[PDB]
Structure 1
Amino acid sequence: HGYVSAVENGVAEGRVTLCKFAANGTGEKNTHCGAIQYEPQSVEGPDGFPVTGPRDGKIASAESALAAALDEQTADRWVKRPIQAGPQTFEWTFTANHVTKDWKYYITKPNWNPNQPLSRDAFDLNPFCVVEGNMVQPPKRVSHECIVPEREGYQVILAVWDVGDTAASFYNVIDVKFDG
């Protein structure tokens, strides 16, 4: 159980995180998140993305009933956090810091459709950033350096935390805004 945060040096909070915690600087929160807003750490779903894992249209929720609200996808739906290309630090907070296989970060294709539910077609399915967890428990807050690709405007980053001793993973989409 954990979520992408911006308490120490993280660049951008997860979508689900912003249902509970105000964004740095702007103070913005996501709304109408449903029951997951109580527990943004709980976006757990099937292992094996992208070959298996959550099916198209249920990536953002990870097929969680509590988190079904997160699958909505429009231009106006979610709080966007500024980002730039190049080195950036991603952060996780874990309420339950499970033994970890790895963390993987995926970004939307430039011309992804921000008004359709997320699907594999929307993403570059080759992670732009992979951090190994080595089947040990991480600390309860961690930071990951990632080299982020160029994009213009609104892009989504899918952060996947793969638990090392179970057939589950945690899935946190991040709504980001590049310049342009």
Structure 2
Amino acid sequence: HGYVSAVENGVAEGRVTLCKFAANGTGEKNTHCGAIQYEPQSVEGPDGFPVTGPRDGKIASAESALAAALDEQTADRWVKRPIQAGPQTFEWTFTANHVTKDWKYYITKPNWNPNQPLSRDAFDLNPFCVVEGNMVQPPKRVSHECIVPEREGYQVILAVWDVGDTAASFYNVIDVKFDG
């Protein structure tokens, strides 16, 4: 169990994280998140994305029983955190630091549709960042150095934490705003 955070050097908090913890600087929170607001560490779903894993339109909720509101998608729906292309640090917090296979990060294609559900077609499915977990338990906070692709305006980053000893993964979408 865990979530994408910005407690130390993380560039941007996960969408679910902002349902419970206010954003750095602005103090913004995501609203109307439903039950997952009390358990942001619990966006757990089937592993194997994108070959299997959560179906289109259920990526942000990971098909979770508690997180269906995260699948809502409009250009105005979610708090957007500023980002720039190039090297950035992504950060996870683990309330339970399970044995880990890897972490993978995907970004929306340039002309993705912000008013349609998130789908495989919305994302560049070649991850822009992969961090090996080596099938061991990580520390309860990790920092990943990733090279963020060039984009303009609102984009969504999908951070996938694949747990090594279950058939599940944790899925945290991140709403980001590039210049323009």
Q: What TM-score results when the alignment is normalised by the length of structure 1?
A: 1.00
CA deviations 1:117-161 (Å, max 9, x no partner) are: 000000000000000000000000000000000000000000000
Deviation, structure 1 residue 65: 1.5
Aligned sequence identity (%)? 100
User: What SS does structure 2 have at the residue aligned with 1:35?
Assistant: helix
In the alignment, is residue 173 of structure 1 matched against residue 173 of structure 2?
yes
Partner residue in 2 for 1:117: 117
CA deviations 1:85-121 (Å, max 9, x no partner) are: 0000000000000000000000000000000000000
Deviation, structure 1 residue 8: 0.3
CA deviations 1:17-64 (Å, max 9, x no partner) are: 000000000000000000000010000000100010000000000000
Q: What is the CA–CA distance in structure 2 between the aligned matches of 1:83 and 1:53, rounded to whole Å?
A: 27
User: What SS does structure 2 have at the residue aligned with 1:135?
Assistant: strand
Q: What is the CA–CA distance in structure 2 between the aligned matches of 1:158 and 1:48, rounded to whole Å?
A: 14
Q: What is the CA–CA distance in structure 2 between the aligned matches of 1:68 and 1:34, rounded to whole Å?
A: 8
Unaligned stretches of 5+ residues in structure 2 = none
Partner residue in 1 for 2:12: 12
Unaligned stretches of 5+ residues in structure 1 = none
Q: What is the CA–CA distance in structure 2 between the aligned matches of 1:60 and 1:168, rounded to whole Å?
A: 15
- After superposing on structure 2, the runs of 4+ consecutive aligned residues of structure 1 that deviate more than 6 Å are none
In the alignment, is residue 87 of structure 1 matched against residue 96 of structure 2?
no
Q: What is the CA–CA distance in structure 2 between the aligned matches of 1:117 and 1:32, rounded to whole Å?
A: 17
Q: What is the CA–CA distance in structure 1 between the aligned matches of 2:147 and 2:56, rounded to whole Å?
A: 26
Partner residue in 1 for 2:144: 144
Q: What is the CA–CA distance in structure 2 between the aligned matches of 1:165 and 1:2, rounded to whole Å?
A: 15
User: What SS does structure 2 have at the residue aligned with 1:69?
Assistant: helix
Q: What is the CA–CA distance in structure 2 between the aligned matches of 1:26 and 1:100, rounded to whole Å?
A: 33
Partner residue in 2 for 1:157: 157
Q: What is the CA–CA distance in structure 2 between the aligned matches of 1:55 and 1:35, rounded to whole Å?
A: 21
How many residues were matched structurally?
Answer: 180
Q: What is the CA–CA distance in structure 2 between the aligned matches of 1:33 and 1:65, rounded to whole Å?
A: 12
